Amino acid sequence: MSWLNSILVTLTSVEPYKVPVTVIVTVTFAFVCFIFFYLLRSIRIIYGLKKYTRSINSIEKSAPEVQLEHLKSLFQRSELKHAWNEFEESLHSQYELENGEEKIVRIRATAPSASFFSEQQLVDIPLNTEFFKHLPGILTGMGIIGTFYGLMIGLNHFDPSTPEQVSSSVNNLLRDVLYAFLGSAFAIFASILVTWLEKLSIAKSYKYLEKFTAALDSLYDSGVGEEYLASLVKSSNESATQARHLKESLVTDLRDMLLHLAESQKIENERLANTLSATY
Amino acid sequence: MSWLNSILVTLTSVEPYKVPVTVIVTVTFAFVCFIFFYLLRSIRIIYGLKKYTRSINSIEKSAPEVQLEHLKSLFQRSELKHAWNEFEESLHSQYELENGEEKIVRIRATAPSASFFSEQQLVDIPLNTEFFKHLPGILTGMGIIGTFYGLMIGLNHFDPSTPEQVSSSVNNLLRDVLYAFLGSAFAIFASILVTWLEKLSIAKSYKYLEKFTAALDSLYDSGVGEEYLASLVKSSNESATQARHLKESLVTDLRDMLLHLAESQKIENERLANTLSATY
Amino acid sequence: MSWLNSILVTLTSVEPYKVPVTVIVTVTFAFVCFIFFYLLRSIRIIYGLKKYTRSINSIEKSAPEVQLEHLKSLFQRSELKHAWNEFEESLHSQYELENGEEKIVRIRATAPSASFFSEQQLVDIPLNTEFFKHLPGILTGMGIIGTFYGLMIGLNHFDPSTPEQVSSSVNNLLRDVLYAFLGSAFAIFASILVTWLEKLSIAKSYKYLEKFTAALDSLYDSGVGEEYLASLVKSSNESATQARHLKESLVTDLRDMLLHLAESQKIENERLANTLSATY
Amino acid sequence: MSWLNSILVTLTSVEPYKVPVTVIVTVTFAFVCFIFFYLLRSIRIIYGLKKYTRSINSIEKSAPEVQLEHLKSLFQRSELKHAWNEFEESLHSQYELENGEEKIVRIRATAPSASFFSEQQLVDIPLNTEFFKHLPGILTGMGIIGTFYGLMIGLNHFDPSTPEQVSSSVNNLLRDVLYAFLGSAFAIFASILVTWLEKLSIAKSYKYLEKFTAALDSLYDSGVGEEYLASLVKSSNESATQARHLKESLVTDLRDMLLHLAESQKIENERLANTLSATY
Amino acid sequence: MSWLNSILVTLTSVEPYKVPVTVIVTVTFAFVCFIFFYLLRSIRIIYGLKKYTRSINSIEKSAPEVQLEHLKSLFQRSELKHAWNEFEESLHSQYELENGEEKIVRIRATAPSASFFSEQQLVDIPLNTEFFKHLPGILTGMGIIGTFYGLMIGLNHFDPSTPEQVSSSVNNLLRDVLYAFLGSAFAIFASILVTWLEKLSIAKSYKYLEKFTAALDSLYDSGVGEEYLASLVKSSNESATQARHLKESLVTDLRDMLLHLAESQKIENERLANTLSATY
Amino acid sequence: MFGNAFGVKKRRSDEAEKPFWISYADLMTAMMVLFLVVMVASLSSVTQRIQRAEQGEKARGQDISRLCERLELHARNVNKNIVVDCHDNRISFGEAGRFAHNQFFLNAEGQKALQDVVPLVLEASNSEEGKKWFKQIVIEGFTDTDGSYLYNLHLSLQRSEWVMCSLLDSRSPLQKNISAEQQLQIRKLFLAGGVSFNNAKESKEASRRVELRMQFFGLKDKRDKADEVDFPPVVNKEVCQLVMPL
Amino acid sequence: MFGNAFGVKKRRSDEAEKPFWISYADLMTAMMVLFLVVMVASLSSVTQRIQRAEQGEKARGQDISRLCERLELHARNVNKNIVVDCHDNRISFGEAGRFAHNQFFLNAEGQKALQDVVPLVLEASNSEEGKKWFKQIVIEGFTDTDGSYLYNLHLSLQRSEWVMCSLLDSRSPLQKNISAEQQLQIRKLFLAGGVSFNNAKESKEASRRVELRMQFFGLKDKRDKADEVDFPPVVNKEVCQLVMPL
Ligand SMILES: CCCCCCCCCCCCCCCCCC(=O)OC[C@H](COP(=O)([O-])OCC(O)COP(=O)([O-])OC[C@@H](COC(=O)CCCCCCCCCCCCCCCCC)OC(=O)CCCCCCCCCCCCCCCCC)OC(=O)CCCCCCCCCCCCCCCCC
Ligand SMILES: CCCCCCCC/C=C\CCCCCCCC(=O)OC[C@H](COP(=O)(O)OCCN)OC(=O)CCCCCCC/C=C\CCCCCCCC
Ligand SMILES: [Ca+2]
Ligand SMILES: [Ca+2]
Ligand SMILES: [Ca+2]
Ligand SMILES: [Ca+2]
Ligand SMILES: [Ca+2]
Prior knowledge:
The complex is a heteroheptamer, with five copies of chain A (280 residues) and two copies of chain F (246 residues). Chain A is mostly helical.
């Protein structure tokens, strides 16, 4: 086929040195993109998590309203602003009637802080981990492509057809193989370096996000629904008891009023008898 | 048997160029299928999610009903129509008696919006990610099969029966290896490209789906069950004192009524005595 | 060692053509086992899911009891029967007095349908995906094993004693390498074919299971517990108001009866006065 | 470095046949460890799960107290004792006062049994599936070490100084390659066999664990909390209606008794009039 | 490019023995880091978990207050201190009235202790398993880079000019690759050892964490909310019945009191008649 | 507050080995095997002429060794005086072949050994190995570098002529134990003549000796038929022309 | 029913890549390249050895041919009766080399040609081709197959001895013409061989002849001091052994 032979002469026409150069340049571009979009971003995320954890620890012993205002003013970055809004929705404010007004006496947790400051939303999506965990494989595959294409160039040049020029063919083959393996080794080195950096960064991000959510979880106490159920059960029992005592007390008061009415009737009857005796 | 030799004569009879052409054609067809069924679909999904987020970020200040019909009319997809119906079932509408009728005053969220507008229902199943995440392995396998078949062709051609035929045979076999490696190199390049695009599409889709569900989550507030339990506990606590006060007020009213009855009886029987004495 | 040489003679004693035949037959047997135990079962599962979805969509506009009976009769496979029993006992039936017996007026969903008709329960375990996702690697490994074994046979039987013995041994080596290439090509072809069929089947199974569980999820509404709590809160408030109103009505009507009693006593005492006057 | 030179010269002087023997011994030891620590344990786990499932299916139609005693006896002399204890804690026993004694009439499930009889604590931890999914790779690594070392030894020994030495060099090289291929073939065969065996056994283990936890779930029904909430709602409505009717009935009774008292007073005053007439 | 040739002659000018020593030193430093930060850390974690489990099993029969104080004093490591604090927030203390006081009679569990003493918190974050599970791949990559570097050194120095030069160049290339493969085989052996140690350590950490949480779960009984709902339902039914009974009892007492009043007023009417007769 | 306790989560389903890596290992192994076997075939093809020549040389060596071992075994069986050097194809009569100064005869043992070994060597040459690889026999002469050169040359030449006489002189004991065909074979297989100088031995008495050194065809010679000539039948008995009484 | 719908999710640690098939594939990539390189290098090296041996043998043959050609040209220039055959490395005498019955000396033309050819042989061995390849020269005697075999052998051997004397006799012109170094070199080169009986065409005139042939080092042959026998310097004149009345 003319098409396939033209394709081969086009591919093999490139100078062999451009193959390791292309692999190294593109793999270095991938490494630079990894540094900019994953590594520095994760460093910023870790520093922000540490600073937020420090801020939360400073309001451990403050009033619940003051704590709430400080946390609302603290969280302003978009994803943590949304996470804080949802978390504050999860928090349950217990009100008591004090000095004629309803005041928040205690804020109760209903869900863990990690349910809204999740690893996904705060780490995995901003860092694009769904893509970057596959970058080392892409780099290794790029090295493999360089390896095939370099050995293709080397096998293409190997066609001596004469004992005198066998040495030149062997030299060219060794040079092309050397280029291919330089590219492959650089790609593998970059892939393992990226693996090191990304896994270390993701581990540190998860560790400090755990510290941040633990700091948030220590502000508010959970288990309020069970306390409400216990209050309801106790209320029902004391309600039956109070009902029976109110019935008995009503009966007693009714008896007292009826004996008082009988005494008043007796007084009226004796006064009537006295009046009749006076008249008679 | 002779069956194996017969088939080996059959397979290794094709021209060496026909194998890289077949590998390139099939790998290109699979790449085009990836672009059509996956990449364009993922792009459409991402733009749809962006458009949907804009509309939700637009009704954030509307009345809860108007928001509800706007969201009902907004979601016209089969997966998203079902997800919206289930999410609306998850929302708890609060009614208060206004103008003699029950009107929605507030709509509360009982589950996160991602429980219904989830990644599997909106991205993984529409994109067939359970299949397309294994496509690069299929492409590389096709390339390896092509390389193996070309190697069989080349090895069948290799037969240096004379010392003077060794160089020609070796060169021809290296050329056949070149063909087979061309097939493998193209397949692996295409697989790496597919992996890059597919992972990037997943990352973008997940990020934009998170933005969409965050927009939906911001419309409604949670914690309705704890509020209901707190209201029930407060009602029971107030109802105990209500029963006690009602009983006390009833007893006091009975006391006043019986005192008035006794006074009326005194007046009436005094009048009776006076009339009887006068008539006597 | 003598042991190593005895092992080599025992292993190599087989005919060279029996290695490609063994690889092809073993890979074909694994492919047939895959077709029988995975592909046909997956096709049956998908067809059953589509039929069940059609049946569920047909029963949408029926009474709750009829829907329950139809769905109970529908699911007869052991995994489907267990899943339906669990889902049905997760469903909440609301009874209302209409008009002398308990009648089901509505059925509510307290859990997603996918909690019981899950991918693990209905696709992953029946299809034995925990084994079959590793089959293509086994196929490629058998190809590699056949390559090594065929070359062992070729190398051990190399006879350099005499020049035509050398020629025959070299021909045998070339045939063995051709055989190894053929076996590897067949193994990798069957591996990628199994991968394609398996991943396509699993993706279609997930798609149609999602459609089926969406069909079940459309039959019933969620949020029944929040509605019950709202009803309880409203009932508590109305009970407070009703208790106050009932006390007011009771005291008013008691005042009325006591006024009636006083008036009747006055009238009867007037009659007594008339009788006393008639006596004189 | 002198130490590196000594290590290289001693590693080059190793007999080529010792490398395949070491590969075979090490891979056979790994396979024996696999059989002892994974395969036999998986068989025992599967048999125990089937025995437990048969025991559970024998109390489908038994009284709830007898069922609980049977299950406690079944799991008490076992490693599943604590899992069963937690599961029974998750069970809600409904009581009814029959013949003056509180008796268990029904048992309700409040959580799935898979949450207590988990896959990790029943299958993964006992079988060390975390490690044994890596054993085929371990065997592959042993194979590649042995093969590369043997091929290096063979190439080091291969050096035809004169064209008359080509035959002997070729023969010795083929022997060394045969040894290396023997090692690799054994290692890769054991890798594939281990993969097949442990994947099949883990699939069976998951299947029978599912059958076990489904037999546990088939005993008891869920949704008791929604039933309790529905009962509370009905009781509240009926209590409002009951309060109204009790107030009305008390009013009617009070009216009747006051009418009777008025009649008695009228009769007494008529008797007084008769006595006054008699006195005249 | 002259840059590529310059870097090639710079890279390949290093002595061939410096590749294996570099690979061995780097792999050994990574292994020492693994031992110090993961293996020793996990051993300490397992020892601490066993000691804590022993401590918890010794307060099984203690009073709720005493065992609560013991557990509060027991947990002082920061991660387990926070975990215990949140777990104790999850525990629901039930109070009863003894000697006119509210004291704890029983502590109930609302969440499993694994929710707070989770695998992440107590094992995964301390051991950095998000990073250390990728270490074998890094070690393997370093070995591969070493082998490729040695091959490149051997290929750069190849001289195919004369047959003696060819033989010497082949010997030098094989020697350099043999050094590099010494380093690579060390890397693969260390990768195997790290894989085994890591998987065994993580499996045992999960096992004894499960045992620890099992010891903590056995102290407190779950299922308190369903019991509270059942108590509320029973209280509602009893309240309806008691309402009717109290209404009937109040009617009976009112009838008795009015009968007594009628008798008393009849006696007083008789006394008045007697007095009137005496006055006559 | 109203979460679903029955929500299930997928297990820890570890993915399979990526097929590309195992397929690539398969392909790389196949390529390594292909290059090995192609090297083996190419090397066995380029050197097949050299291999065949070396095999033929080894076969010639084996045949010559077998023939020499048979001849020396016959010598050991028959006469202890005849010692055969198979390493360099020499027949030695050391003790019986010593030559005193300025004489060209030998003691009785020299003649006994010579006329005993000639029929044995003839029988060896008449065999298929002899009829395939055995050329004529060269009589070895040795001279020293001291004294007048031509006197030593004449002494060696007279020694060779005496050896040939003793092989083919009338009344000799060999002539009574011979047939006409055997005499013709001796005439064809023997040439008398040859002188040499060597210093490989420590004593000058060693140079005073005679030896039989048979030589063979080369691999590419293969018994050129045109080289052979013919002799007429013997009409009268041979007479030695050296001075026996001296 | 008492759980919370806002619970933690994504509790899924990513599985680490299986690294060992990657190692297998990359190490077989390196091994495949190693085997390819060894294939091409070994093929090139073996072919280079084969062609080197072939061209070395051809160069040795060319040097031998050039030496023979220049020696024959010098022979023609000196005197015309010389017959030199490069095809078998033999210098013969056309007619002057004949012999009659009971004759052991060449004619005057034969002696003149024998004396003339010696300096040509000395020059031939002196040149670079002689130093590289030239062995010692043997003298072969030829006689008809008729007559007494011992008579023919003795006569031809006497002819060879007379030729050697004429080479080295003091009364011969060579001794008074050559120097001591040339005499020593002649002692090293000229040797006496055997007697041949190549009788053909029934021509006794040309059958009874003597010609000299030169031998050459083989390609694998080694030059060493053991084979280089050094004659001591001439201390006394040499008188021949066959006197004229014979
Ligand atoms: C013929 C030989 C020729 C071949 C030699 C090479 C072999 C290669 C094979 C490759 C690997 C195949 C292994 C498959 C089986 C292992 C699977 C497994 O997990 O077993 C379960 C089992 C433990 O789980 P289980 O089934 O529940 O057991 C019950 C528990 O014991 C009790 O229950 P529990 O959970 O309550 O217990 C508490 C728990 C929790 O306690 C802890 O704190 C443990 C957590 C961390 C563990 C720390 C241990 C560190 C040890 C350091 C190194 C020791 C040896 C290393 C050997 C390699 C060096 C060459 O404690 C443990 O689990 C500790 C036991 C682990 C130590 C095992 C004993 C040491 C060596 C075995 C001696 C027998 C000799 C055999 C041959 C030796 C090899 C030459 O582990 C074993 O007993 C395995 C031992 C079998 C042999 C292992 C060989 C080592 C492999 C390393 C790779 C070699 C690479 C070369 C290095 C060179 C670098 C330059
Ligand atoms: C646990 C490994 C997992 C899989 C590994 C695959 C194969 C790799 C290994 C190994 C080499 C084969 C083992 C041989 C053991 C025999 C020991 C013995 O009995 O004798 C003691 C011996 C005496 O014999 P020699 O004098 O050496 O005989 C020379 C004859 N030519 O003296 C000794 O004390 C021990 C000497 C050790 C020899 C072998 C060294 C192997 C060490 C590590 C192997 C690592 C992989 C190889 C990489 C090589 C890269 C340069
Ligand atoms: Ca807390
Ligand atoms: Ca919200
Ligand atoms: Ca629904
Ligand atoms: Ca059930
Ligand atoms: Ca418990």
